[PDB]
Design a protein around this nucleic acid. Structure first.
Length: 1030
DNA sequence: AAAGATGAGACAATGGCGATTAC
RNA sequence: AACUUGAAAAAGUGGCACCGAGUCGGUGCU
DNA sequence: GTAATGCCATTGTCTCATCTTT
């Protein structure tokens, strides 16, 4: 019946889950193909695909290549030519009058005379072949074109991507600095001078340098080993950015995108500066002016050189090997090399004024076909094309007949391949592979459900959990924040009580040092060795916004000092402590937003605009890659129309933030422990589906925030009730408190302690449909997380590109044995190397006989790529790593109660919750400490039948008995390390406390030759099982 | 005096080859 | 992934509920 | 006589030391 799909897209895994209307995961029977006695299996519609981030045919298919671009352009030209055919059949001065195509184009925009159709085709073809990028959607407008708005958007993306140590830019006049007629580096230095906290070599400084047209190096900003240089004008920038993102992750993708956007604004401001006419073709006019300056400077240079310096003329115009003018025109010499070569010649000669101010501006003797044109957006070419069509509209009727055709040719980006759409994206090859896998997963899932499309497809871009290498970077940043703030203020608290970066990971201690060792609400000193009695209060309550960052947290002895209101802290405290908050503000100890929230009672208190800001902060996804993935899935899923040109959206693509599902897990103890198995990807997908369906059922009018598409822009300020209960939940007004996840909660604890109550059954106000049942639905979620059968599949992949094995091959044949060469039947795995692959596939029999095999059973040869799956006895599974080695193939389905216990024991000191809640968790752990022994038993019984590494199992059990005296937290943390013994995939060494357990490898592949081979679909729901006993 | 860049050295993870041992 | 058809791009092939839940099982319907 | 059970090789990361630049 009706269902929804939840997706957790990552760079090494893709989680997927299918949910019903009552938030249940269906269990279905699937057919099993092959030649065994198993014809049906029961599987839950939940799982996760796992895959390598490596060199593969698919990977090369997802890379940008010149040929695909070429055929694209060629096709466009073919369309254009078909449009021009019927009229073309009827249809020195040119080269001298127009030495470049931009002259002809400007003539066609500025001439009313009738022109030859061939030249018109030349203009249109030039605008179509190199049409420019599609990063800005719609018509040009100052909101997406002016330098100011895009600079603010860039620094907003920057501050959003970190939110600690951020740069605040309000006083800056981005237009006056960036649009000024000066050199790129001087514009960069002028903008940096206006930002005292940032420097040219910083990340933001390098972004500005990238947007201005320089070549910044991002190694120091990300500590990369290999230098990664980016130039927007360079043709190989996109793949370079894709390489760069692969090293640092795709979270920074939008940052570089914003830099690109800023560049476009500057270019748009550089061409619109000069207006010889009121409205014109700015690009063509700029190229003509560039041509004119080139001609003047050229003739003047030749005149001056011939008059004053007859010598070395040949070195500039004839030699061409040392990057002269002949190398600039006839050789492989870039513009920067030519400038570097001719700068001292211009510096030495007399009468060289005016040429140098143009040279320093990098606009001296420029060509018309240069590296900068990659930055030209397509809206400019679309404007000029519309202009040309309008000028020649009445003269040629077929231009009137074919306006929308040409416009579609320029604007189109029909349905092409999925690979080209994914290749155009701005991301690492890993996330592009994951996106392709996600699309295929969706296709198979809708195939599995009888070709019924889901009602909702919720997408989360899975966050990369801390790799611990960054766990020290964060401590370093907060340490620099504490040291700069203390040095700025002048209170030597660090002298009397020294601390190191290791201890600063604790929230309360970091807040203690962030607040100069003083209470935020009261004028008294805090007790250094009584922080457990002190509470961490939220400036903006959790009932309004779920913000647990340092930006919205304060440390105080009691949160009753905020006063009686459920809003920001009262005016009686704000008026008294505003001076101290201003001292903490100007010392860069806190951000501007935290001071604004702290001093919000002076401006009335929380307002509808603040609540609207909270709703937009919680509900909208900033990541562009996510929007493009949602666009791909929406376009492939929704393809119906009506009589008009309106898109019927049968399937809603919901985009969710990871913070929502994470907080949902933390609030209702649906805890995630990634180290147990790979089920947590699928679980995250399920919880995403649940949260997404709940939100779209609860707030349909807020669809424009999450659902992808063109909806009615529903304002959020007007939908807020005036009163808590009188107008909230009794009228059309959807909610008074701005936190969207309140309806999941049974109780709502405000900042004073009053406990607000919410109905047992949450229903939609307009349609009267129950959206959440606080009993049955949480029980259902727990039951789903408790299911032991979740489909974990390792994508088998041929290797492409000692020799590397492309794939292994099962050969059943005979080999000669002994002096007499008696033929003996054998069945063995042979590794086909990458160099050997083509020869083996050309004629397998000849290759095998050259290897020594005889009487090969051609029809029994089986191709076995890496990770091919085999099942043996008692459900034990192995994956093919090689021709002579196997990997573990099973997942340890630990019950939910033990997962939650492990999360709680390992999260002993770090809880980030209320004191009562913390006491409940602590008493739960202590009352359930026997779960440690039970988890060990589970590891033992799983390992006994599935792993068969008895030396390591004995080592493990021995160490666990050795350390049963240790604290619960440590034993939990080391059981977390113990789950690598049982994880799916390659065996790996690990540690229980200090005792190291070395990997037990499966160094023989013999047993798989008589096991059951399992070929698996991308989702693992469809499988074929072959009993290799034969 | 502090920060950035380049090269080399211990880590980490997985697979392959050779020698010793066991059936 | 496997299988079928194709030189290839590429097309096709795997029933639904309920009671449970140790890697999925059982029962009813079809 | 054949097959099963420590060190080396390859691809990526990270940290430390020295030299150069702001």
């Amino acid at each position: 019946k009706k269902y929804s799909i939840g997706l957790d897209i990552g760079t090494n895994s893709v989680g997927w889950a299918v949910i019903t209307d009552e938030y249940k995961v269906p269990s279905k029977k699937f057919k099993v193909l092959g030649n065994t006695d198993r014809h049906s299996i029961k599987k839950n519609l939940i799982g996760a695909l796992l895959f390598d981030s490596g060199e593969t045919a698919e990977a090369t298919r997802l890379k940008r290549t010149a040929r695909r671009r070429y055929t694209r352009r060629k096709n466009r030209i073919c369309y254009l030519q078909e449009i021009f055919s019927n009229e073309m059949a009827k249809v020195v001065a040119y080269h001298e009058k127009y030495p470049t195509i931009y002259h002809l184009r400007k003539k066609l925009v500025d001439s009313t005379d009738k022109a030859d159709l061939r030249l018109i085709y030349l203009a249109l073809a030039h605008m179509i072949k190199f049409r420019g990028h599609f990063l800005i959607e719609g018509d040009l407008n100052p909101d997406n074109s002016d330098v100011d708005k895009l600079f603010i958007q860039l620094v907003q993306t920057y501050n959003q991507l970190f939110e600690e140590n951020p740069i605040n830019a309000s006083g800056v006049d981005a237009k006056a600095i960036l649009s000024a007629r000066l050199s790129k580096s001087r514009r960069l230095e002028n903008l940096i001078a206006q930002l005292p906290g940032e420097k040219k070599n910083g990340l933001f400084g390098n972004l500005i340098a990238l947007s201005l047209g320089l070549t910044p190096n991002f190694k120091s900003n990300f500590d990369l080993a290999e230098d990664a240089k980016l130039q927007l004008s360079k043709d190989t920038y996109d793949d370079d950015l894709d390489n760069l993102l692969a090293q640092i992750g795709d979270q920074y993708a939008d940052l570089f995108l914003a830099a690109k956007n800023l560049s476009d604004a500057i270019l748009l401001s550089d061409i619109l500066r000069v207006n010889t006419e009121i409205t014109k073709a700015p690009l063509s006019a700029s190229m003509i002016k560039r041509y004119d300056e080139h001609h003047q400077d050229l003739t003047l240079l030749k005149a001056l050189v011939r008059q004053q310096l007859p010598e070395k003329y040949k070195e500039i115009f004839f030699d061409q090997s040392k990057n002269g003018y002949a190398g600039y025109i006839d050789g492989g010499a870039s513009q920067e090399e030519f400038y570097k070569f001719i700068k001292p010649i211009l510096e030495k000669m007399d009468g060289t004024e005016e040429l140098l101010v143009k040279l320093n501006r990098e606009d001296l003797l420029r060509k018309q076909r240069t590296f900068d044109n990659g930055s030209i957006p397509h809206q400019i070419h679309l404007g000029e094309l519309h202009a040309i069509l309008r000028r020649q509209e009445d003269f040629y009727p077929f231009l009137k007949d074919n306006r929308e055709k040409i416009e579609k040719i320029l604007t189109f980006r029909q349905g092409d391949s999925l690979h080209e759409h994914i290749a155009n994206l701005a991301g690492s090859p890993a996330i592009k592979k994951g996106i392709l896998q996600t699309v295929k997963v969706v296709d198979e899932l809708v195939k599995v459900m009888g070709r019924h499309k889901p009602e909702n497809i919720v997408i989360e871009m899975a966050r990369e959990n801390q790799t611990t290498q960054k766990g020290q970077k964060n401590s370093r940043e907060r340490m620099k924040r504490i040291e700069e703030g203390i040095k700025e203020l002048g209170s030597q608290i660090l002298k009397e009580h020294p601390v190191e970066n290791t201890q600063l990971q604790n929230e309360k201690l970091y807040l203690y040092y962030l607040q100069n060792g003083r209470d935020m609400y009261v004028d008294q000193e805090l007790d250094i060795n009584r922080l457990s009695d002190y509470d961490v209060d939220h400036i903006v309550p959790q009932s309004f916004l779920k913000d647990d960052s340092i930006d919205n947290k304060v440390l105080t002895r009691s949160d009753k000092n905020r006063g009686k209101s459920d809003n920001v802290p009262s005016e009686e405290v704000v008026k008294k402590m505003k001076n101290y908050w201003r001292q903490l503000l100007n010392a860069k100890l806190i951000t501007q937003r935290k001071f604004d929230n702290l001093t919000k009672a002076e401006r009335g208190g929380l307002s509808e605009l603040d609540k609207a800001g909270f709703i937009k902060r919680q509900l909208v996804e900033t990541r562009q890659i996510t929007k493009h993935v949602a666009q791909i899935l929406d376009s492939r899923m929704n393809t119906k129309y009506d009589e008009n040109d309106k898109l019927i959206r049968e399937v809603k693509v919901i985009t969710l933030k990871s913070k929502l599902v994470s907080d949902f897990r933390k609030d209702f103890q649906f805890y995630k422990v990634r180290e147990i198995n790979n089920y947590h990807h699928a679980h995250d997908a399920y919880l995403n589906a649940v949260v997404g369906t709940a939100l779209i059922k609860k707030y349909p009018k807020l669809e424009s925030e999450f659902v992808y598409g063109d909806y009615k822009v529903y304002d959020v300020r007007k939908m807020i009730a005036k009163s808590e209960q009188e107008i909230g939940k009794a009228t059309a007004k959807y909610f008074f408190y701005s936190n969207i996840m309140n309806f999941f909660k049974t109780e709502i604890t405000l900042a004073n302690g009053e406990i607000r109550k919410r109905p047992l059954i949450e229903t939609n106000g307009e349609t009267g449909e129950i959206v959440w049942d606080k009993g049955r639905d949480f029980a259902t979620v727990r039951k789903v997380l408790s299911m032991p059968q979740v489909n974990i599949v390792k994508k088998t992949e041929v290797q492409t590109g000692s020799p590397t094995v492309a794939y292994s091959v099962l050969v059943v044949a005979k080999v000669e044995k002994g002096k007499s060469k008696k033929l003996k039947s054998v069945k063995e795995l042979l590794g086909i190397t990458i160099m050997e692959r083509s020869s083996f596939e050309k004629n397998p029999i000849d290759f095998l006989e050259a290897k020594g095999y005889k009487e090969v059973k051609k029809d029994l040869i089986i191709k076995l790529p890496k990770y091919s799956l085999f099942e043996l006895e008692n459900g034990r599974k192995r994956m093919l790593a090689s021709a002579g080695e196997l990997q573990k193939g099973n997942e340890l389905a630990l019950p939910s109660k033990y997962v939650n216990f492990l999360y709680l024991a390992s999260h002993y000191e770090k809880l980030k919750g209320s004191p009562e809640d913390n006491e409940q968790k602590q008493l739960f752990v202590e009352q359930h400490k026997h779960y440690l022994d039970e988890i060990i038993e589970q590891i033992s019984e799983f390992s006994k039948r599935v792993i068969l590494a008895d030396a390591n199992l004995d080592k493990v059990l021995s160490a666990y008995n050795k350390h049963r005296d240790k604290p619960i937290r440590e034993q939990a943390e080391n059981i977390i390390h113990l789950f690598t013994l049982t994880n799916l995939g390659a065996p790996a060494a690990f540690k229980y406390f200090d005792t190291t357990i070395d990997r037990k490898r499966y160094c023989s592949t013999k047993e798989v030759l008589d096991a059951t081979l399992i070929h698996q679909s991308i989702t693992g729901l469809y499988e074929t099982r072959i009993d290799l006993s034969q």
